[PDB]
C-alpha cells in the first residue's frame, strides 16, 4: 500500500500542471513551463527583460488535438500550437499623461498640445505622440513619435465662450479633486484651477 | 479643513504607470506538443498498477481540451496551386 | 521501423511521401521496398517482417 | 402550427440581464504579498526534509510567475523634480 | 514514511492555492483570498452587496 501511494503523489503533481497548462491553452495564451522558449533568444539577439515582454504579449492558436496511442497503460497524445510574437523596439517604462484644464476670463482658454506622453526614464524628458494604440496588458502602440516642448515647437490657442457658472470637478485618482470654478460658495479661489483634499466629508 | 495648490498654467500630470510598447513586427510560428506518458513513468517508478491510474487522469485532461478545439489545418501556401490540394 | 510515435503526424507523412515517391514505378512498388518472403530481391526498405 | 400576439405600438421588450453599474470614480493603490515559506512551515509539521519539499515547490512556482514580469518602477510624484532621480 | 507523507499532503494543498493565485496574477485580475480587503469596507462606508461589485 505504501509502495502505491508514494507513486499516487507523482501522478496529482502532474495532473496540477497538466489542468494549468489546458486553462493557458483554452485562454489563447502560452504556458512558457512546457515550451523551452530558450533557442529564440539566441537567434533574435534580445535583452533579459525584453524577452519577458515577448513572452508575456503572446497570441496561441490550437488547430489540431489527437491521440496516437491507446494501449491500457500507455498513452500518447499531440497538440499543434501555432502562435504569434510582437517584437518591440522600445519600452519607455517611466511615463506621465497630460491632462489640460486651462483658465477661463465667459471665455474658456485652453492650451493645444501635440505630444500626449512624458518620459522620464532617460536623463532628459521626451515629448512622445501615440498613435492607433491598443490596450491589452501593457499598451501597444503601432507609431509613437518624439516632439518637441512646445517652445521648436508650435502651439495653437483655442478660446471658446461658455455660460455661468461653468464648474468642471475631476477626481484624481489619488484621492484629491482638480476644481475650475468661476464662482466660490467654497473657500476656493476663483477662475484659477485647484487641487483640493478634505480631510471629511464636505459639499 | 481642506488643502490647496494652485497650478500655474492649467496643466496637470498623471501617473499613468502602464508601460508603452511601440511594436516593430509581427512573427508567426509553428509547434507541436507530443504529450506522453511513458516519459514520466520511467521518470518516477510507477509500478504497473499505478500507471494505469496515470493514462486515465492523462486520458481525461486531454479528452477535456479536445471537446472544444475545431481541428482544422493552417494555410501555408498560394490560394491557387492544385498540387497541394490534389496531394 | 521509419514510423515511430516519435515523430509528428506532419512529419510521418512526409516521410511516408518522400519513400513512396522514390520507390515507385507508376503505381507498382518495387521489389527492394518488400520483405525478403514476399519477393526475391526485397530489402524492408518499406514493410518489416 | 403557428402561435400569435399582435404588438400594439410597435415596441417590443428585451430581457437584457446585465447590470449597470453607472462609476463614480476611480481609484489607485499599492501593495506587497510577501510570499514566506517559514509561516507554512511552523504552522504544519515539517521535519526539516518535507520542508525542503516545500521550498523547492514555491522556489518554482515564483521562478515561472517572475520569467514573465518585467520589473519596473511606479511613477508617484513630478517629472520636473531632480532630487528624486538623484536619489 | 508516514510521518514524511502526511506533511506531502500539505505541500499539495498550499501548490494549488499558489497555482491559483499564479493564474489571477497572469490574468490581471485580483485574488482576494490572499488579500484582507476588510480595512477598505470601514474607511469607505459600503453595503456587504456594493462591496461585491
Ligand atoms: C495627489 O497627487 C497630487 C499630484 O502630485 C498631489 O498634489 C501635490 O501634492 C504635493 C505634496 O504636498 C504638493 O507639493 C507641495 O507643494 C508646496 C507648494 O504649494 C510645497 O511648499 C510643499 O513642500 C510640497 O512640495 C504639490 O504642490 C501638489 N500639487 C501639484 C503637484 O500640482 C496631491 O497632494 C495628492 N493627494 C494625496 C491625497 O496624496
Ligand atoms: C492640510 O493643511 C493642514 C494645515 O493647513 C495640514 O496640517 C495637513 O497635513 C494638510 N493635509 C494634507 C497635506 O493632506
Ligand atoms: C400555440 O397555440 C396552440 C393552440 O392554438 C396551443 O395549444 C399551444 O400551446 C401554443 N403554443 C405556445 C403558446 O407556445
Redesign the interface.
Given at each position: 500500500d505504501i509502495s502505491i501511494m508514494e507513486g499516487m503523489f507523482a501522478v496529482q503533481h502532474v495532473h496540477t500542471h497538466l489542468n494549468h497548462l489546458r486553462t493557458m491553452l483554452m485562454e489563447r495564451r502560452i504556458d512558457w513551463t512546457y515550451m523551452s522558449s530558450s533557442w529564440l533568444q539566441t537567434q533574435l539577439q534580445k535583452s533579459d527583460d525584453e524577452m519577458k515582454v515577448i513572452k508575456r504579449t503572446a497570441r496561441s492558436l490550437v488547430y489540431y488535438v489527437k491521440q496516437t496511442y491507446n494501449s491500457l497503460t500507455a498513452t500518447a497524445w499531440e497538440i499543434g500550437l501555432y502562435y504569434e510574437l510582437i517584437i518591440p523596439r522600445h519600452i519607455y517604462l517611466n511615463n506621465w499623461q497630460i491632462v489640460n484644464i486651462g483658465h477661463l476670463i465667459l471665455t474658456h482658454v485652453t492650451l493645444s498640445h501635440p505630444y500626449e506622453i512624458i518620459n522620464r526614464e532617460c536623463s532628459n524628458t521626451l515629448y512622445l505622440h501615440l498613435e492607433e494604440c491598443r490596450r491589452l496588458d501593457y499598451v501597444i502602440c503601432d507609431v509613437v513619435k518624439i516632439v518637441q516642448p512646445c517652445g521648436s515647437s508650435d502651439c495653437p490657442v483655442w478660446a471658446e465662450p461658455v455660460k455661468e457658472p461653468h464648474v468642471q470637478i475631476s477626481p484624481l485618482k489619488n484621492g484629491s479633486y482638480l476644481v475650475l470654478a468661476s464662482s466660490t460658495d467654497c473657500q476656493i479661489p476663483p477662475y484659477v484651477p485647484s487641487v483640493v483634499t478634505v480631510n471629511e466629508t464636505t459639499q | 479643513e481642506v488643502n490647496m495648490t494652485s497650478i500655474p498654467q492649467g496643466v496637470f500630470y498623471q501617473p499613468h504607470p502602464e508601460p508603452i510598447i511601440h511594436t516593430e513586427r509581427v512573427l508567426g510560428l509553428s509547434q507541436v506538443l507530443m504529450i506522453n506518458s511513458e516519459n514520466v513513468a520511467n521518470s518516477a517508478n510507477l509500478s504497473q498498477e499505478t500507471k494505469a491510474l496515470l493514462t486515465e487522469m492523462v486520458n481525461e485532461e486531454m479528452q477535456g481540451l479536445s471537446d472544444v478545439m475545431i481541428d482544422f489545418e493552417i494555410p501555408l501556401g498560394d490560394p491557387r496551386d492544385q498540387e497541394q490540394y490534389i496531394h | 521501423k521509419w514510423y515511430n510515435?516519435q515523430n509528428?503526424?506532419?512529419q510521418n507523412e512526409n516521410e511516408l511521401?518522400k519513400r513512396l515517391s522514390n520507390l515507385t514505378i507508376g503505381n507498382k512498388l518495387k521489389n527492394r521496398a518488400l520483405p525478403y518472403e514476399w519477393a526475391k530481391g526485397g530489402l524492408n526498405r518499406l514493410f518489416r517482417n
Open positions: - | - | 510515435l509528428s503526424i506532419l511521401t
